[model samples]
Target chain A: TLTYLGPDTEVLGDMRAKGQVRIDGLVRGSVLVEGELEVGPTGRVEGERVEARSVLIHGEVKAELTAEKVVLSKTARFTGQLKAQALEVE
Target chain B: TLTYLGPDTEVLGDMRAKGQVRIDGLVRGSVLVEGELEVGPTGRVEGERVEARSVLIHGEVKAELTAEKVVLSKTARFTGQLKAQALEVE
Candidate 1:
């Protein structure tokens, strides 16, 4: 199952997951995952860092991302450093 | 965060997961997951089916996959059928 952070929603705490997570709102804390992560167009995250295997973003993000692979869509607005084996941005 | 199926690696049985899984190698059986699964750029799977919450495939697969979401990446060669609530391809 997936969790929704509804549009315009804001949160202020670390979100950790052992399963897949998709964000469609705003989060103001670090995110740690043992699974893949997908950030929707309306999503936004401001945090210290993120760790995952793969990530797909189509919104705005401001944090350090550490993963094996990362994909950023054309509409994505990002301001942070990323460390991964591969990264694709459009 | 991930599992790599090295370029020439191969497995011959069913693979199951309750968390995120990334494959950069090859498998000759079914994959079942309660979380996310990513088939790397050179991964391949041939079996009867797979089940997961989300899937990202970039290689080859010849089985039926059931999930809530599925993404097929460029350079990903796929066959057989899939069932998901949402699907994206690169």
Candidate 2:
């Protein structure tokens, strides 16, 4: 399953999920996803930490990311540390 | 219109589009989108440069991004420069 966060939305506090999470808005807290974490073109994330199985970035992020696999697209702008088992660029 | 780059996909060389571009795979070159650039969780980008009106990242990016607005999710990992009119975090 996927959780979609639409544009013009804002989320506070931590978010934890077993399925995938797609962000098109704003998140102000940490995110723990067992599946994947997808950040769309309008998304913004500022958190203490982010943990997931796989992570995809198309937005702006300011937090530490821990995942098994991490992917970043051309639109991504990030300022934080990342710890992943596998990482791909392009 | 919107262009979707699906998972398990790869694009080499440069790409130019007048509308939104959604990437869920890999881009190995520069990207120029007049509209938004959305990078999903499975996406990876290693480009020389990126130009867009708005950009959102949830994956990995290794390029310079120039946009009017840029958003980054917690899952994002970026290793490049950014030049945007506005930037959002969280």
Candidate 3:
């Protein structure tokens, strides 16, 4: 399954997704997922904690992350702790 | 133009959504929408304010609401001020 948040959308609450969720907007809340998580290249995610199986970030995130695989983009701004089993920088 | 927040999901921040947004879970922040908004029969929405063009609630809400049309369910537990152009109770 796939979920998408557009650039004009913004959520100030926690999100719990069961599929691969892509964020190209702004979410200032917690995110809990059982699948993959993708952040926007120009999005904003500000939360206390984010959890998923796999995470790819290409935007600005200021939250602690926990995932099996975490991928950070070259131009992404991340300011949080990572608890991933594997990490990748692209 | 449809979004849904299922049960067992929780949000601790603000959420801005366009189109039609449905909530069957919990949100603990602010909500700003450009279209229709719906709450679950057992959903919990606790926010500072919730703004939408049309709103239909059938659950629990504890925030100020601004909408063009507002419809409240008989079983809904709402604890907020209504600022709508029209109101309905069904």
Candidate 4:
């Protein structure tokens, strides 16, 4: 099963999550997701190293992102490097 | 990879997902997620049968939820039947 971090939640400090996760809240630390990572419109991520299998961003991201597939939505406001095998922007 | 339904999206018909899914949008039909189903704070699901491996609700759900484990957050407002091995409320 996937682990969800909803809008009412917030995480600080380094974090490691297994499986998939959708962030709808503020995450102010480095995140290492074993599976997919999705940042919702209301979500925000600010860290040093954020890694995942696949990354979909529709929100704000201030960290360097690393994933197999990195997709940034038209609404995404990212301010860092993107390292991925595949990427898409809309 | 997990399929994310963001707050800017909406589904009006039956839907089926492969790995996992997080709903931050308005889904107004039956949904079948092979993995896990997460309804975020801004999400709203209204349908007949919504099935998944595990279900996590933090918003409004007006459908029958079927899963191995069903968890509802303190801010959740669910108005439907829950079929699960375990149910947790916070």
lDDT of each: 0.75, 0.81, 0.81, 0.75
Model 4 residue pairs with clashes: none
DockQ: which is higher, 3 or 4? 3
* Candidate 1 wrong stretches, greater than 4 Å: B1-90
Error of 3 at B49 (Å): 1.6
Query: Would candidate 3 be rated incorrect, acceptable, medium or high by CAPRI criteria?
Result: acceptable
Chain B TM-score by candidate, in order shown: 0.88, 0.94, 0.94, 0.91
After TM-score superposition, the amount by which residue A90's alpha carbon in candidate 4 deviates from its true location, in angstroms, is 16
User: Per-residue alpha-carbon lDDT of model 2 for A1-90, expressed as tens digits?
Assistant: 858885888988898888889999999999998897899988999988989988888888888777777776667777655556555543
lDDT of 1 by residue, B4-50 (tens): 56568788899776788888887899889778888887787888888
Write one digit per residue (lDDT tens) for candidate 3, span A20-64: 677878777788888877887868888788889998988998888
Model 4 lDDT per residue over A14-84, tens place: 55655667777676677777777788898888888888898988999999888898888888898989788
Candidate 4: TM-score? 0.50
TM-score of each candidate structure, all chains considered together:
0.49, 0.51, 0.73, 0.50
> On residues B13-89, what C-alpha lDDT tens digit does candidate 2 reach at each position?
89998887899998999998889899998998897888998898888888877787777776777665655656555
Local error of candidate 2 at residue B75 (angstroms): 0.9
Lowest-sum lDDT 10-residue window in model 4 chain B: B4-13
Local error of candidate 2 at residue A40 (angstroms): 26
**Model 2 CA lDDT for position B33:** 87
Best by TM-score: 3
Please tell me the TM-score of chain B in candidate 1 relative to the true structure's chain B. Answer: 0.88
